[PDB]
Design a protein around this ligand. Structure first.
Ligand SMILES: C[C@]12CCc3c(ccc4cc(O)ccc34)[C@@H]1CCC2=O
Ligand SMILES: C[C@]12CCc3c(ccc4cc(O)ccc34)[C@@H]1CCC2=O
Ligand SMILES: [Cl-]
Ligand SMILES: [Cl-]
Ligand SMILES: [Mg+2]
Lengths: 126, 128
């Protein structure tokens, strides 16, 4: 499994890819059988095509920005958690969303699970 | 209460940090379900039940002064879970150090913590 230092680098790279909006590069970071729960509480998304569709829908228009708001926390069993802020426009209202992602990596450094914690209580109008 | 709403999760998890900061072990243990599990750090074997959880917090908080504070908002779901970023300050080698942590908590139908997972390792420890 990736080391704690490697998890920090992978999760930071993921945020960099979200921020520039490269959907294909993001999808490549996921394992074949990965699941995404975003927001956590909703049914998982499974499969490369469906994960790509989710990022295409979320990031498609451009105008999404994302940045870490504190350090990546990493374990020694290939998992980590990170806090970040997403900036977007929701029907002409510029908004920000505070999120924590929890990720579990496989032995190849790919994302096996992703769980995103947020709800409407984490939304703010700018 | 019942299963906490997202707003209630934010309040419960913020209170937990206040109780860590002041070091009220009994009040912390009362927030946990009787059969709760703690994984701290995540990756180590779970701790089961209030007796073992009390012992863990008394070992961690019972000695030198520990301070804890949120470093950003609590993220909450609609299914009784949340995640929060915070910083713990304590002493190591006679000097102050800081540890950055993210806890993930799942609450039960009575508003008590059923599982807690704490994400951190030595890469999150800092000094000077
Ligand atoms: C999908 C989304 C944009 C990106 C995004 C959101 C929420 C959680 C995320 C978690 C991620 O790891 C990456 C991107 C998002 C927003 C919710 C509403 C929206 O437009
Ligand atoms: C135990 C501890 C103080 C408190 C604490 C630590 C780590 C994770 C935590 C998670 C919590 O939800 C509450 C308290 C801690 C530190 C690790 C070493 C130390 O001194
Ligand atoms: Cl932080
Ligand atoms: Cl934050
Ligand atoms: Mg019960």
């Amino acid at each position: 499994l990736p080391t704690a230092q490697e998890v920090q680098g992978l999760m930071a790279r993921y945020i960099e890819l979200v921020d520039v909006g490269d959907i294909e590069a993001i999808v490549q970071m996921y394992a074949d059988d990965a699941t995404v729960e975003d927001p956590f509480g909703q049914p998982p998304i499974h499969g490369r095509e469906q994960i790509a569709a989710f990022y295409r829908q979320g990031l498609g228009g451009g105008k999404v920005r994302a940045c870490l708001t504190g350090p990546v926390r990493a374990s020694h069993n290939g998992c980590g958690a990170m806090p970040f802020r997403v900036e977007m426009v929701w029907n002409g209202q510029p908004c920000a969303l505070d999120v924590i992602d929890v990720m579990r990596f496989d032995e190849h450094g790919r994302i096996q699970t992703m769980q995103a914690y947020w709800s409407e209580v984490n939304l703010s109008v700018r």
